[PDB]
């Protein structure tokens, strides 16, 4: 059971991103640290550099790159990431 | 009054962003809408690259360019202004 309201990436990339998110949530407690770990993992695997935003309640409005922006919600928080 | 948690930009740019955020908050009363208005104002003011995030429980660690970063708290909401 998962949810991804909006994303722009390859099917294999989305599966890898989902797997990375679960590993980051399992191996990190601080939201910023998990976001930094996810960003570094994404950067090392999806053509650095990029950025991500982690929180609990925040409206998003930005202009990312084509096929370089994903968003999903897991556990209690929601994750939004996009390549700079 | 607004308190800047973190800021890496010109003082005039920081003041301009504060004025835009206050004007957007007075006009737009929705977190997504206020951020969109702030992002639109920021892009037309300083440079085409812009990144406005509006929220109350959003703490993220993302790489940002020099002289193009700002994070200020106005009232009860948190505003993060940067260039994409």
């Amino acid at each position: 059971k998962a949810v991804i309201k909006n994303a722009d990436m390859s099917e294999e990339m989305q599966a890898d991103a989902v797997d990375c998110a679960t590993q980051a949530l399992e191996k990190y407690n601080i939201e910023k640290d998990i976001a930094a770990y996810i960003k570094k993992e994404f950067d090392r695997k999806h053509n650095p550099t990029w950025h991500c935003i982690v929180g609990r309640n925040f409206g998003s409005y930005v202009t990312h790159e084509t096929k370089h922006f994903i968003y999903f919600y897991l556990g209690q928080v929601a994750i939004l990431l996009f390549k700079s | 009054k607004a308190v800047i948690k973190n800021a890496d930009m010109s003082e005039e740019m920081q003041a301009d962003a504060v004025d835009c955020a206050t004007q957007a908050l007075e006009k737009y009363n929705i977190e997504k809408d206020i951020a969109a208005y702030i992002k639109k104002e920021f892009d037309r003011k300083h440079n085409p690259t812009w990144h406005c995030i509006v929220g109350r429980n959003f703490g993220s660690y993302v790489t940002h360019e020099t002289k193009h970063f700002i994070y200020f708290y106005l009232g009860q909401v948190a505003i993060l202004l940067f260039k994409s």
Partner: peptide, 23 residues
């Protein structure tokens, strides 16, 4: 280009003549 959102009371009383010896 994108839009998104997220402990018992004790009573003690000194009795009359209990602590005082007249002699």
């Amino acid at each position: 280009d994108t839009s998104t959102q997220t402990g018992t009371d004790a009573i003690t009383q000194i009795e009359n003549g209990d602590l005082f010896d007249f002699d």
